[PDB]
Amino acid sequence: AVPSVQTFGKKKSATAVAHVKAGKGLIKVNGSPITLVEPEILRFKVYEPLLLVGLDKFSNIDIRVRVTGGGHVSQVYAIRQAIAKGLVAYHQKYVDEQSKNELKKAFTSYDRTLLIADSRRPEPKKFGGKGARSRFQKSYR
Amino acid sequence: GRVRTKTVKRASKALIERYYPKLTLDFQTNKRLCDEIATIQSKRLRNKIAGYTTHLMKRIQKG
Amino acid sequence: IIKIRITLTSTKVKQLENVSSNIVKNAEQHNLVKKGPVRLPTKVLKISTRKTPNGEGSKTWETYEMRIHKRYIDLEAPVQIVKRITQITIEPGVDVEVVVA
Amino acid sequence: LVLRGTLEGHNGWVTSLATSAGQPNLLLSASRDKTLISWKLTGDDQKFGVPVRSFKGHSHIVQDCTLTADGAYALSASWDKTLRLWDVATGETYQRFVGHKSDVMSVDIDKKASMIISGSRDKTIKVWTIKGQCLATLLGHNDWVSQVRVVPNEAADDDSVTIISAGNDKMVKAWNLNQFQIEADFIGHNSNINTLTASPDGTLIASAGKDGEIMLWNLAAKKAMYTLSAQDEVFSLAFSPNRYWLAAATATGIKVFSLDPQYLVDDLRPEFAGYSKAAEPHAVSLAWSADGQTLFAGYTDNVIRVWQVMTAN
Amino acid sequence: FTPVVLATPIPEEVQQAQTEIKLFNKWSFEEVEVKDASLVDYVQVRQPIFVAHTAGRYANKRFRKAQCPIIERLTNSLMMNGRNNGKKLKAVRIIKHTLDIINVLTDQNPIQVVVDAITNTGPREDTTRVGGGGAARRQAVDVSPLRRVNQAIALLTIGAREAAFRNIKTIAETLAEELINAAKGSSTSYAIKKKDELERVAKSNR
Amino acid sequence: ALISKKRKLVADGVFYAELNEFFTRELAEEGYSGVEVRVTPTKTEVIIRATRTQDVLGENGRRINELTLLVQKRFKYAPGTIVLYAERVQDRGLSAVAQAESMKFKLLNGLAIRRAAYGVVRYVMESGAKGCEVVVSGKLRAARAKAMKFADGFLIHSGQPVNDFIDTATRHVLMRQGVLGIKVKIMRDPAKSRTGPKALPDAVTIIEPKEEEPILAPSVKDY
RNA sequence: AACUCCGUCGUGCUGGGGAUAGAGCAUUGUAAUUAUUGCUCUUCAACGAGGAAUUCCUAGUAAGCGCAAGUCAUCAGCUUGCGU
RNA sequence: CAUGGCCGUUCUUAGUUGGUGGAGUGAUUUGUCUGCUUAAUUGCGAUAACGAACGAGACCUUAACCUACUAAAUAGUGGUGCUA
């Protein structure tokens, strides 16, 4: 009954949630098409999961992504995190597992953290400076 | 900076000299044994104790 | 029967979780629908004083924290058993309020 | 007894293999990487088989796996103190078994899929229903129950089921589920008993462990028959179903023992490229095929090796 | 090329050039090659990328920045002098405009023009300082292959920044002018004038 | 009610600190060591941790009925909604607050500093402590201040186990020459600890194995 | 908020910069003069990248960018944190 | 510059001290070290020292992982009604 997988993708505060169900082939982000994700110079960043494995694989599935948090650049890195995980986890459940490795091999060999979210996290500020490492200027006389 | 200290090192030698024919050469089933044959306060320490135990056994069965 | 709600607030994790455990244990001793413990996000109350009296020395700062843990359980019960379960589980450090409806 | 290739696709030690009598080319393997993989054997020298479905959902090492006779249902025993009942098709879990206080080391099911037995590291053995109900706790070991097996009863379906439960306490115990009581006790293992098995007919008991020895027993007779020596720490143990052979997984290689007469069939040492003598990969799981011509051996190479019997001339 | 139709249109110019070859913005990483040995394994044009925006960890090891593609190492060096720090989405636009302008003035592959600029404008013999006591004499030394790539990107983007500063021509065009005039040894570029000046100083001090 | 829990839980803290400083000042001569409040419906109750309860509980109910009024007058409680109990002390040889007041009042009777302080450290060691340390700092016998420290056993002061096994107390003793400072640190051993951790974090105990029989008599025993 | 897109400007101390100053309207306050602060129009200074010196910094760091809290009735060009 | 308490600093480092034995008339010394190693008096070892104690580490908080457990109209998601 309506074979569907939900998954998530993350970058730095952002959490995109993907809803990968079987269907006709609409790929919509926040209710709007994937062709409208607009920093418009990172528009191809949501396009690598659609082009590394080929556009044919999306002809029978439906994608619906919602993002919150993060920034304009951090969110763009979060849809592609969720699209890639949303297709390899669809294939783990509803089609042959041999095909899952072939797509997992494609994304990992081009790893811009499509499947594995990076562990770089902000360092806390300290006293005596305006940043984590930066210190105030000292005067010495 | 991976030097074990005399808490981990001295405990592991004492744990081999009386439990030698119970410990394997595998870490994952050595740390499960360290919960039974020893009382160690923190999870971080018994992973360090069982890891050095597993390292010592690899050079016991060599010589 | 009546719809009730019990709200628990404390600064001690160990003293609060067992009180909520006694609440639910008395809840299925004589069975009734739970709507069990929904833990609210913990509140960290920060006070950042400097370090010192008078401002001599390096400008060193402290931060002090009080942690507020809050839990509410939404029960329904006959009127009789309400008072006894609200009075048995009384422990120092845990503040319990019961909303009638 | 020659190999025609390997199986790749696991990222950890392949801890247990299990095959089904129904489908002769359906192999189920559970590994250290918290997953189970159901394969499809093709009989090709380059790729003897391919994976078709991965069963993920265990939080830690999956120590033992078993199939049913018809191969539709699968059981997984894992270190997360739970057991899971899987559908081999569509990869979902119907029932989760909970109640062990420690790691679950083994799982077995009877032929009629009525009771499920499970050894553990909590020194207890629990008998489960098909809907996740724990019937009784067959305590009585003094250490970790390293592996359990259910003995296949004799013909005409007599109502008497016995299970055999090795442990680190150096006793093999035969249990009686008709009364949930201990039936027989076997004494004489001088080290940890890693593995044990039973004959297809359900009379022989073979058990082995750390000392480098295998002891054959007779549950029908309740006498120990004799012991062998393998000079290597014994990991797994498997009876051939029709050839009347006993396969043993050792630290050095697969040693196949014939008992009529008493001699060694073969000592299987695969060719490993790029390792040293001390860092020698070894088999930690054995499974004879249902038809009886093929044995499988999961390794610490994270790679399943396939051996099938062939007459020399 | 047998286009695929689906509920989201995904316009025709997108998948036609990208399903089979993963190009640049629209540019090819095929038939581009480092003409100068001792800069192979330090100029990375071997794994193609779509845009020069790769949130990659290249600082955590000594030589991992060599595996960063050199187009991103030019967008990284544009975010400089303070008011432009952390403004990478502006730097990709400049580079996207630069490779379009480079193709217009000379009809070769603009990726190839960049590699020609890097291979030329790296110093080949540099000078270090020997203190002793007093006069602090200089000593001529060699220069690493990695530092040659590190300094060539430095000199090119500094020269484009200084040329475009109080000028009506944009930073994209002056970066294009600097890269074209450095692909040949024209000595009308900031980097080539700098490179042979550093080399002739070391020649005196050898 | 009608107060946020952030202001409610903080106000409970400052109420406790005001009560504690009151009883240190008031029951100084009775060896007071602490309080705890039990905020219950129907008469929230207060327990006083003082050694000589026969002095804290005065003649015929005085000297604690007085203190019951003093608390409910100052904190605007309804009458009868607060009661004051006095259970004595759990092992007064191991409380640093009680042993600092003992050190303070021994000084005010004109005891020598080295004798009053070695009589406190040896009492705490007699009480099953693993280590304690007493510091006296001030103008001891001269016009220029010095600091004398008296120790026995061992003390750990490194980390989280300080919050577990160290009890500290500071007291200002008022003398003819000026003010002396009293600091008492007591490290109760973790073996007799009832709650929380019962050992130092880097303490490992190996369970001694029982030796077995080699041959083990290969045979079967049946039922 | 920086940022992104489209347009106006066009190498000119210019539509950069907004110091100094004039007139009005409000807000907090018992009270605003020695402008508390906010807003509207007008006024349009130096400053064209800073000598000897000298500070901080090794990765989600430096730097850019704002936001909350402390102080508070009103006043943040400061600090303590936080994210982009 | 008569003090208590608090704080800064020496001091972003690895340092400090008993007991018994040995050396020296003694102040003191050895232990606490040639070498190698470590962020570390961290270890391997050497050894007139042996066995110890504080500091370092261990510890606690916090940030990263969990398609695992416990369930949430004060957090969501999907279907279902009604409806644009």
From TrEMBL, chain E:
Keyword Ribosomal protein among record annotations: yes
Domain Small ribosomal subunit protein uS7: 50-206
GO BP annotations, alphabetical order: translation
Pfam families attached to this UniProt entry: Ribosomal_S7 (PF00177)
Residues where Mg(2+) binds: 164, 167, 169
Cross-referenced InterPro entries: Ribosomal_uS7 (IPR000235), Ribosomal_uS7_CS (IPR020606), Ribosomal_uS7_dom (IPR023798), Ribosomal_uS7_dom_sf (IPR036823), Ribosomal_uS7_euk/arc (IPR005716)
Keyword Ribonucleoprotein in annotation: yes
SUPFAM superfamilies the UniProt entry points to: Ribosomal protein S7
A GO-annotated cellular component: small ribosomal subunit
PROSITE patterns: RIBOSOMAL_S7
Key words of the record: Metal-binding, Ribonucleoprotein, Ribosomal protein
Domain of life: Eukaryota
GO molecular function ontology, one term from the record: RNA binding
Stated family: Belongs to the universal ribosomal protein uS7 family.
The protein's name: Rps5p
Organism: Saccharomyces cerevisiae
Source lineage: Eukaryota, Fungi, Dikarya, Ascomycota, Saccharomycotina
UniProt gene name: RPS5
